Design a protein around this motif. Structure first.
Motif, mmCIF file in Angstrom:
data_model
loop_
_atom_site.group_PDB
_atom_site.id
_atom_site.type_symbol
_atom_site.label_atom_id
_atom_site.label_comp_id
_atom_site.label_asym_id
_atom_site.label_seq_id
_atom_site.Cartn_x
_atom_site.Cartn_y
_atom_site.Cartn_z
ATOM 1 N N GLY A 8 -16.549 8.395 -10.744
ATOM 2 C CA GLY A 8 -17.431 8.931 -11.788
ATOM 3 C C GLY A 8 -16.599 9.877 -12.649
ATOM 4 N N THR A 9 -15.757 10.707 -12.005
ATOM 5 C CA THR A 9 -15.264 11.927 -12.661
ATOM 6 C C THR A 9 -14.226 11.581 -13.706
ATOM 7 O OG1 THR A 9 -13.811 12.539 -10.783
ATOM 8 C CG2 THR A 9 -16.123 13.452 -10.787
ATOM 9 N N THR A 10 -12.995 12.021 -13.494
ATOM 10 C CA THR A 10 -11.868 11.697 -14.356
ATOM 11 C C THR A 10 -11.408 10.281 -13.933
ATOM 12 O OG1 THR A 10 -10.199 12.505 -12.771
ATOM 13 C CG2 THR A 10 -11.008 14.147 -14.350
ATOM 14 N N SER A 11 -10.770 9.600 -14.887
ATOM 15 C CA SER A 11 -10.081 8.368 -14.599
ATOM 16 C C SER A 11 -8.598 8.482 -15.003
ATOM 17 C CB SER A 11 -10.786 7.228 -15.244
ATOM 18 O OG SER A 11 -12.016 7.071 -14.575
ATOM 19 N N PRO A 12 -7.794 9.009 -14.074
ATOM 20 C CA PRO A 12 -6.382 9.180 -14.351
ATOM 21 C C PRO A 12 -5.610 7.897 -14.596
ATOM 22 C CG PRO A 12 -7.001 10.529 -12.452
ATOM 23 C CD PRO A 12 -8.207 9.709 -12.831
ATOM 24 N N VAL A 13 -4.628 7.964 -15.488
ATOM 25 C CA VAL A 13 -3.627 6.921 -15.651
ATOM 26 C C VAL A 13 -2.497 7.242 -14.695
ATOM 27 C CG1 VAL A 13 -2.089 5.746 -17.237
ATOM 28 C CG2 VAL A 13 -4.355 6.457 -17.976
ATOM 29 N N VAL A 14 -2.184 6.326 -13.831
ATOM 30 C CA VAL A 14 -1.199 6.584 -12.739
ATOM 31 C C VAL A 14 0.012 5.663 -12.871
ATOM 32 C CG1 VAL A 14 -0.884 6.588 -10.296
ATOM 33 C CG2 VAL A 14 -3.073 7.290 -11.261
ATOM 34 N N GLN A 15 1.206 6.265 -12.933
ATOM 35 C CA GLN A 15 2.480 5.530 -12.869
ATOM 36 C C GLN A 15 3.347 6.109 -11.764
ATOM 37 O OE1 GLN A 15 4.226 5.164 -16.844
ATOM 38 N NE2 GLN A 15 2.554 6.261 -17.619
ATOM 39 N N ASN A 16 4.112 5.249 -11.139
ATOM 40 C CA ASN A 16 5.197 5.669 -10.208
ATOM 41 C C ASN A 16 4.728 6.566 -9.040
ATOM 42 O OD1 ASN A 16 7.416 4.426 -11.885
ATOM 43 N ND2 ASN A 16 6.563 5.902 -13.359
ATOM 44 N N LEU A 17 3.570 6.232 -8.512
ATOM 45 C CA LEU A 17 3.079 6.860 -7.263
ATOM 46 C C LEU A 17 3.677 6.091 -6.128
ATOM 47 C CD1 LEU A 17 1.363 8.824 -5.832
ATOM 48 C CD2 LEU A 17 -0.487 7.090 -5.899
ATOM 49 N N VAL A 18 4.546 6.734 -5.376
ATOM 50 C CA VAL A 18 5.273 6.088 -4.288
ATOM 51 C C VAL A 18 4.854 6.720 -2.947
ATOM 52 C CG1 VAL A 18 7.474 5.565 -3.294
ATOM 53 C CG2 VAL A 18 7.163 5.415 -5.745
ATOM 54 N N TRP A 19 4.200 5.943 -2.094
ATOM 55 C CA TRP A 19 3.821 6.386 -0.724
ATOM 56 C C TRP A 19 4.608 5.507 0.253
ATOM 57 C CZ3 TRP A 19 -0.042 10.076 0.910
ATOM 58 C CH2 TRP A 19 -0.302 10.013 2.294
ATOM 59 N N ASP A 20 5.734 6.000 0.716
ATOM 60 C CA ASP A 20 6.580 5.258 1.614
ATOM 61 C C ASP A 20 5.933 5.072 3.004
ATOM 62 O OD1 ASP A 20 9.486 4.320 1.937
ATOM 63 O OD2 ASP A 20 9.293 5.587 3.712
ATOM 64 N N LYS A 21 6.307 4.002 3.660
ATOM 65 C CA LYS A 21 5.836 3.681 4.955
ATOM 66 C C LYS A 21 6.131 4.761 6.009
ATOM 67 C CE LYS A 21 4.847 -0.435 7.451
ATOM 68 N NZ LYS A 21 5.191 -1.685 8.101
ATOM 69 N N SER A 22 7.094 5.622 5.752
ATOM 70 C CA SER A 22 7.437 6.684 6.704
ATOM 71 C C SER A 22 6.464 7.857 6.704
ATOM 72 C CB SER A 22 8.840 7.195 6.384
ATOM 73 O OG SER A 22 8.916 7.764 5.086
ATOM 74 N N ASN A 23 5.445 7.904 5.818
ATOM 75 C CA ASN A 23 4.346 8.891 5.905
ATOM 76 C C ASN A 23 3.467 8.544 7.042
ATOM 77 O OD1 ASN A 23 4.789 10.717 3.432
ATOM 78 N ND2 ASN A 23 4.822 8.594 2.584
ATOM 79 N N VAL A 24 3.345 9.482 7.989
ATOM 80 C CA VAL A 24 2.574 9.268 9.205
ATOM 81 C C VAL A 24 1.183 9.777 8.978
ATOM 82 C CG1 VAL A 24 2.294 9.901 11.624
ATOM 83 C CG2 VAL A 24 4.509 9.172 10.740
ATOM 84 N N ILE A 25 0.190 8.911 9.236
ATOM 85 C CA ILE A 25 -1.241 9.219 9.017
ATOM 86 C C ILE A 25 -1.842 9.602 10.370
ATOM 87 C CG2 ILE A 25 -3.486 8.296 8.246
ATOM 88 C CD1 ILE A 25 -1.942 6.283 6.561
ATOM 89 N N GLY A 26 -2.274 10.859 10.496
ATOM 90 C CA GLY A 26 -2.808 11.393 11.763
ATOM 91 C C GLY A 26 -4.205 10.903 12.054
ATOM 92 N N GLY A 27 -4.657 11.191 13.266
ATOM 93 C CA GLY A 27 -5.933 10.723 13.784
ATOM 94 C C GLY A 27 -7.057 11.743 13.985
ATOM 95 N N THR A 28 -6.909 12.985 13.544
ATOM 96 C CA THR A 28 -7.917 13.947 13.679
ATOM 97 C C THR A 28 -9.305 13.519 13.121
ATOM 98 O OG1 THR A 28 -6.389 15.842 13.813
ATOM 99 C CG2 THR A 28 -8.609 16.307 13.157
ATOM 100 N N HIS A 29 -9.282 12.816 11.981
ATOM 101 C CA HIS A 29 -10.507 12.407 11.318
ATOM 102 C C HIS A 29 -10.986 10.982 11.722
ATOM 103 C CE1 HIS A 29 -10.819 15.680 8.253
ATOM 104 N NE2 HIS A 29 -9.725 15.951 8.942
ATOM 105 N N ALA A 30 -10.306 10.372 12.683
ATOM 106 C CA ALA A 30 -10.810 9.078 13.228
ATOM 107 C C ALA A 30 -12.323 9.242 13.607
ATOM 108 C CB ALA A 30 -10.000 8.651 14.441
ATOM 109 N N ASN A 31 -13.109 8.230 13.302
ATOM 110 C CA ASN A 31 -14.520 8.166 13.568
ATOM 111 C C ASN A 31 -15.377 8.970 12.632
ATOM 112 O OD1 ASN A 31 -13.117 7.968 16.689
ATOM 113 N ND2 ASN A 31 -14.262 6.249 15.844
ATOM 114 N N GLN A 32 -14.776 9.645 11.640
ATOM 115 C CA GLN A 32 -15.544 10.469 10.693
ATOM 116 C C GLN A 32 -15.702 9.826 9.327
ATOM 117 O OE1 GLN A 32 -16.775 13.291 11.706
ATOM 118 N NE2 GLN A 32 -15.655 13.112 13.620
#
Ligand SMILES: CC(=O)N[C@@H]1[C@@H](O[C@H]2O[C@H](CO)[C@H](O[C@H]3O[C@H](CO[C@@H]4O[C@@H](C)[C@H](O)[C@@H](O)[C@H]4O)[C@@H](O)[C@H](O)[C@H]3O)[C@H](O[C@@H]3O[C@H](CO)[C@@H](O)[C@H](O)[C@H]3NC(C)=O)[C@H]2O)[C@H](O)[C@@H](CO)O[C@@H]1O
Ligand SMILES: CC(=O)N[C@@H]1[C@@H](O[C@H]2O[C@H](CO)[C@H](O[C@H]3O[C@H](CO[C@@H]4O[C@@H](C)[C@H](O)[C@@H](O)[C@H]4O)[C@@H](O)[C@H](O)[C@H]3O)[C@H](O[C@@H]3O[C@H](CO)[C@@H](O)[C@H](O)[C@H]3NC(C)=O)[C@H]2O)[C@H](O)[C@@H](CO)O[C@@H]1O
Ligand SMILES: CC(=O)N[C@@H]1[C@@H](O[C@H]2O[C@H](CO)[C@H](O[C@H]3O[C@H](CO[C@@H]4O[C@@H](C)[C@H](O)[C@@H](O)[C@H]4O)[C@@H](O)[C@H](O)[C@H]3O)[C@H](O[C@@H]3O[C@H](CO)[C@@H](O)[C@H](O)[C@H]3NC(C)=O)[C@H]2O)[C@H](O)[C@@H](CO)O[C@@H]1O
Ligand code: NA
Ligand code: NA
Ligand code: NA
Ligand code: NA
Ligand code: NA
Ligand code: NA
Ligand code: NA
Ligand code: NA
Ligand code: NA
Lengths: 599, 599, 599
Positions: C419-443
């Motif tokens: 709804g809010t802003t609609s950003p124009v996004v270039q060159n967003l790089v999320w490498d596979k080496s970013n580890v995603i934690g589990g604290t919010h699992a099931n939420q």
């Protein structure tokens, strides 16, 4: 007239000589004594009962004089006492009152700083005895102690512990105990030539805040087989830490007992320091016994940008319990450190590790609550002969630890001794970006690179990537049948593995688990049907019931046929794929495959 | 009476005026002179032969007075001499004795600190001449020199080199040479306005320990075409380093000759500093010629958390030999640095690089022994026009270097000039987590992103991952036929590569090697047999004898048939797979495949 | 005789008492007053019109005396004025002249340092009023102000703001404004007990250089609902920064308004600090309005090795424009930080984030020019209940940001409110080496882990890797149909995804794009022909026209047949592969596949 000469020569004389700063008519009309009164040194108290100055030296006990100075400046709301350069001030007796319970020499007081430019040396009265040179407690029972606030010790000076050995293992020795300490620091000082338990301690069981040790040097502070244990700085209050310090030991005994730093409360740090000759780098631990002042959680713990040559472990994690309190350790970062195990025989010092998940002080491995640890961008090296070297020794229960983008060059990556403890392991993450060095290539006969000697592993990731061959190793990763494995991802990249007999080994066939996600290379014998044209090849063995797909990692030297590029399985545990017979005939081939399950 | 007035007005008068601190009856009964004697300044020695104070200034040479002060304080076991604020103290002649061999002005002495609050300025006597302002050697031959210990220079003051140019390229100029230096430091000082070889040097050929430069500023210290070479700090003793300093140059000549720091002995560091206007960031080098004091190995070398705008290379590694000593460099970490090449024309300064593996000073490329280097978590940027910009220029033999989780945005990733040196390369590890930026997209006509211009490569890993297209580049990675390649892993991820003619290029077909593990995209023409049903497709070309599997990276626009999803090979070097003809007929397709060998 | 006693007792008396340092015959023959004149304190100016010293205290306004001291020392080329320990010096009126335009109390002057060892406290005259305690501007209009150079404030002392609340939101309050400030610093000081806008500001709209804040403490500096906004340090000149500081707040209002640091010009840094109780960590922003002194680009921006507990966002990036200037932000590094969102209800403070790409101060999201940012080796944690927690909130146009080797444990990885802003996004790089934690699992019911609520995404990389299951989430990554997606790579690793209904979701089928490179798991129903032998299986659904290959992630429970290991597509959007029927018959299976496009 006679009045005047006598006044001038009296101790009040400077209070009769007028002074106005730079002859400025707008400045205060003062007396010389007022301006002299803006500073204070030990010389102002280092006198006999008739007021005559006493020269320091090995046969003079300066303790009572320094205490008198501290006490007096304290009485005026504080200030900084200089301990003059060009002299050595010896201490030769214990202090009295509240600090006696701590084998105290000098009692620190709030707002009273010490600028140590000269040297402070312990006299042989202290040989074979306990002592704590500066103490900030004001009561023999720390629980009944008042606080120490705004006390800074700084300068180009030296605290020299006289070389004396401990008399008995049970004794304690310290340089500076700030006590229940708030906004206190040591900056610039050299501590040297001793056999002590700690050089500096900050805080008391969580009580204290904003205590720091910066640009200090700690040199040769363990020297005997009597010394039970040593931690050069112990950080026992929050929002405190150590930065830009230098730690060195030369004793053999230091290589087995001595740590540089203990971080034992939340929001503490250890940074930018250099360590040589120590057994250990840092403890990061929440003792339930120390949880009174700041809670039962150690969090925001930072070990960063240090340089170390140690003989045992670089960072040691822990948490434990009491009858009524449980200690927790979480939100830790270990980053940017360059560490090596120094030249030594295998097994000649405690087991070499970059990280150690250690049991409690009584040896219990089932009390810990350690999680949300990030180990990133460090280097570690151990010489090729040191069998007892690991990236992580995981010897007690672990609730999480994440490794990313480190470079580990030692014997083991993950280790725990079989037989010994059987840790419960959750959330152990070893990202593929951890680079495994080759120093120990050819040394690993009988050994598993990742030796998973645990009770169980869950929610874990091990992504093995070699960067050179090591055909001596038994396997890249092995799970004994006693280790459960579930909800995990375990992969062995094929590079430098073509000649390995075993890559990943699951001694209890744990890779079959419903939520186990694995891939690794294996050699597989296949035989085809005789049909010309599109033709099935099937594995001779029937141990692939768990395999979701496989693909060829071998070339095909044949002209008249090709085996399948990719394979599925069959209920009987055979692999099966569709190859091509240009001409008919039963084929028989041995092929290197990437076995995959759910990946 | 007459005695008394005369005494009081005499130089002994302050020694006859009594003082007792704050009128405290328990304090020492002293004289005013005793309290004044607790501090010392240049004014206490800046006098003529009759004892009359001399005001400093451009026509007064303060050198003899400052030396006398140092010499005297040295005679009492040390202390700190203040150089007063609000004045400029000029130096106008050379010193005498042991420091003459070093073009010395002032001789430092042990335990004698200088608190520089005012300014020290060189007079035009020194124009076109060599000089070393403060020297800690006590002998013209450093080998026969005694040590300097416990000497600290600190304050808010300034050392100003007068702007004078060098007279001849062969001359040397320095600010502070501590000599064989143990526990010495410079803190807080600004060095400015010169044409010098170094501002500060620490140690001598390995002799020294615990020397540091902290919170200093170095501003405009190269100004002429005569200046042969400049390194602002040279660290030539172990357990020493530079932290939280500021380095800036504005001269064009600095962009070609000047480095901020040289780290040349073990356990040294360079951290938290900002650099602008320099050719180079830091040398990390073990010169065999400098190995006397601390061994032949430079290890535990740390360059961390710096900010730099440079014109040449950020970190330069080296090691070399003499007739009788061999220098080695290992256990290095380069982390957290944010670096850019400043705005300049291509080729207008030395070849831009984040890391340079440089030859020795005589140009030899076959003497080096450099290994166990970790380059992690840095950023690098060069503007799009700067053709001569590389993540690593690898110009001499390399025994290992590991890159993880960096962000490199420049022209080349790996480069070496063809024709030139042919380095022997082992253990070059470029992890997939290195992010390759897009600033130079469309600028790379004729160019290989990884240009592997080496004699040989072994035990190496290059995992290429693009993050945007660059169809101008000739290839992502190229090996000339003269480069051997063995026991290596070389991969090109397919993303942003669909339109590339060449991805990986092996001009000597080196990817066929038994222990080469490779994967990259290629376009392949295939033709099928006419059979309805399961039907083979085969490549028209026969250059795939090395391929262990391939799979489709193209969609299938056909309804009546599909090519194979996956392919193996045949002995004649064709690829082969089994597709499906819903209706019969010979098919002919051109497909983008991922070619794989042993991965 | 009478002359003499009177002289001695006069303010000139110390100038008649001779002194020679340590009785050394080669030292200057001086007078006591000369040596006393080497130092200066507030006591030298804290006097009434007749020259009698005045004791400080709550009913004494020390302002005029401290100004007189500063003014006088300035007149002699500078020096350091001590503010004595053991006293509290109250300030009780505004200053006059150039600093009146800044609600100034004291005017700083060049080369005049303050060594604050005692305490400086504001009197209730300042209650509900604006104030800036120390000001370095010399003109009410900063544009017409001269510079402040070489001014250092340091010591163990305290600036205490009296606890007074702001009177009106529009008022401003500051501790130290250095002004157009060159080589100025604050070191060691505690700022406490206030309701202020800033504690320290460095520089003015780009004018200034080499200004630093080091080892300071900032405690409880927001206390009211009136306070509009707070940034503890504002860095508005280049080559400047904050290191090794401690920031703490306890007010609820601080959790919503207060930031620790603003870095607003090039070559600035924030390192090694600890923050608790703040809404925000650091702004890194180029305001076009502030671009006068140092250009329109903020580059070489460093946030490193900090520890934070915050309630909103840790690092906030921005750039904006004016009618005539455009601000740009590039070459940023964020590394080594350990950060958590403190215990709080969901939505009770500004939206929790490690990085925020925020709109301008007027809310515009289409003015920004932010690129070449590297976020690496950080940890982030938010408690499981805090729905409003993201690794990155990407709320305005972004021209690039790279994430490597971080550990993020919060609700979202990438978020922006729909709804809010609609950003124009270039060159967003999320490498596979970013580890995603589990604290919010099931939420995560109803929620997309990467919620790509943008106008468009280009030249971007999202490599999703889970480390535990979370079957509550709607998808790992979702693109709404309104988001264009091109020239990007989007992958979902299969581990812990077998039971997910949706993995990657492209609501506008954007993954079909010519230069979109994607892979993710999906469940697919297939049916075969009845042919015995090699036999095709085809998908029942026809939504796979974009798929270049797929492979099985499921085992085959059957003996009599096997489905294909690998699949291609057909023009009608079916998948097709060749399996094997040992016995004939139409087969029907449901299989988990890895769908791939161009990878
Ligand atoms: C050397 C070291 O720190 N080793 C740690 C280890 O620490 C535990 O063992 C050491 C052994 O020296 C300490 O235990 C000894 O000292 C405590 C404290 O001394 C008493 O209290 C102080 C306040 C007082 O001044 C003294 O006179 C004594 O009355 C004794 O109680 C204990 O019997 C004795 O063995 C260490 O104790 C901690 O010390 C810090 C620093 O002084 C204090 O702030 C703490 O209160 C105190 N803790 C406790 C529980 O009493 C023990 O904690 C670590 O456990 C281990 C994990 O990091 O690493 C090292 O081996
Ligand atoms: C500027 C710089 O450091 N550049 C390095 C480069 O260093 C080599 O070249 C520089 C050129 O200036 C130095 O060589 C010059 O100086 C040495 C030393 O001067 C003599 O010894 C000192 C102790 C004495 O005070 C002086 O009076 C002289 O008698 C001369 O011997 C040499 O002929 C001359 O070219 C540098 O020498 C080193 O300097 C450090 C710092 O002073 C000393 O501690 C070392 O002893 C000395 N080394 C040697 C081998 O003498 C040369 O090493 C580096 O080689 C290169 C790789 O990092 O980077 C930069 O270009
Ligand atoms: C608290 C804070 O810094 N918050 C930032 C936000 O900053 C903008 O809003 C703050 C609100 O306090 C400042 O705006 C106020 O102050 C300026 C400056 O005061 C005037 O100029 C100074 C030199 C003088 O001493 C004073 O007497 C005043 O005459 C007012 O112009 C403005 O009306 C008022 O709202 C902040 O202004 C900046 O302040 C720094 C530090 O003092 C100065 O160096 C700058 O010149 C000044 N900038 C401008 C444009 O005037 C505003 O920039 C940030 O925008 C935001 C993104 O980081 O984060 C925080 O919310
Ligand atoms: Na005790
Ligand atoms: Na973690
Ligand atoms: Na078990
Ligand atoms: Na010489
Ligand atoms: Na390495
Ligand atoms: Na060759
Ligand atoms: Na104003
Ligand atoms: Na980037
Ligand atoms: Na759109």
């Amino acid at each position: 007239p006679d009045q005047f000469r006598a006044i001038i020569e009296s101790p009040e004389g400077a209070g009769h000589v007028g002074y106005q700063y730079r002859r400025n008519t707008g400045s205060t009309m003062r007396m010389v004594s007022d301006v002299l009164d803006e500073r204070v040194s030990l010389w102002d108290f280092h006198c006999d009962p008739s007021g005559n100055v006493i020269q320091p030296g090995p046969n003079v006990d300066s303790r009572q004089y320094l205490q008198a100075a501290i006490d007096y400046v304290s009485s005026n709301g504080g200030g900084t006492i200089t301990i003059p350069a060009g002299y050595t001030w010896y201490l030769g007796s214990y202090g009295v009152g509240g600090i006696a319970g701590h084998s105290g020499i000098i009692q620190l007081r709030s707002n009273v700083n010490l600028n140590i430019e000269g040297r402070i040396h312990l006299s042989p009265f202290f040989d074979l005895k306990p002592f704590q040179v500066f103490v900030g407690f004001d009561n023999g029972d720390p629980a009944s102690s008042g606080n120490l606030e705004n006390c800074h010790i700084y300068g180009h000076g030296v605290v020299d512990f006289g070389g004396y050995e401990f008399g008995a293992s049970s004794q304690l020795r310290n340089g500076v105990a700030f006590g229940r300490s708030y906004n206190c620091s040591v900056t610039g000082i050299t501590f040297q030539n001793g056999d002590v338990t700690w050089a500096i301690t900050l805080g008391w069981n969580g009580y204290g805040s904003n205590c720091y040790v910066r640009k200090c040097r700690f040199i040769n502070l363990v020297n005997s087989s009597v010394n039970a244990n040593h931690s050069t700085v112990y950080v026992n209050c929050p929002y405190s830490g150590v930065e830009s310090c230098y730690f060195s030991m030369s004793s053999s005994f230091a290589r087995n007992i001595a740590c540089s730093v203990a971080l034992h409360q939340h929001d503490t740090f250890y940074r930018g320091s250099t360590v040589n000759g120590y057994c250990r780098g840092a403890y990061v631990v929440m003792h339930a016994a120390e949880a009174a002042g700041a809670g039962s959680y150690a969090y925001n713990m930072q070990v960063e940008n240090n340089i170390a040559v140690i003989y045992g472990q670089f960072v040691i994690l822990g948490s434990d319990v009491t009858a009524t309190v449980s200690g927790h350790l979480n939100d830790v970062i270990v980053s940017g450190n360059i560490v090596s195990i120094g030249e030594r025989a295998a097994f000649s010092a405690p087991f070499g590790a970059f990280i150690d998940i250690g049991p409690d002080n009584s040896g219990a491995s089932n009390v810990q609550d350690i999680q949300r640890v990030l180990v990133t961008g460090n280097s570690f090296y151990a010489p090729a002969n040191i069998t007892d070297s690991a990236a992580i020794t995981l010897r007690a229960n672990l609730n999480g630890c994440t490794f990313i983008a480190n470079n580990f060059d030692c014997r083991y990556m993950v280790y725990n001794a079989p037989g010994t403890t059987s840790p419960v392991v959750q959330n152990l993450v070893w990202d593929k970006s951890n680079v495994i060095g080759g120093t120990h290539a050819n040394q690993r006969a009988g050994q598993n690179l990742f030796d998973m000697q645990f009770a169980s592993v869950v929610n874990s990731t091990i992504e093995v990537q070699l960067s050179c061959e090591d055909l001596s190793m038994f396997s890249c990763i092995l799970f004994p049948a006693s280790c459960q494995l579930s909800y995990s991802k375990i992969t062995v990249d094929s590079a430098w593995t073509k000649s390995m007999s075993n890559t990943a080994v699951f001694e209890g066939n744990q890779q079959a688990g419903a939520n186990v996600y694995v891939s690794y290379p294996a050699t597989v014998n296949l035989t085809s049907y005789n049909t010309q044209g599109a033709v099935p090849f099937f594995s001779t063995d029937t141990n692939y019931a768990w395999v979701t797909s496989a693909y060829s990692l071998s070339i095909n030297e044949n002209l008249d046929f090709s085996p399948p590029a990719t394979y599925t399985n069959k209920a009987n545990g055979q692999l099966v794929g569709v190859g091509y017979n240009e001409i008919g005939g039963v084929r028989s081939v041995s092929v290197r495959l990437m076995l995959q399950r759910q990946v």
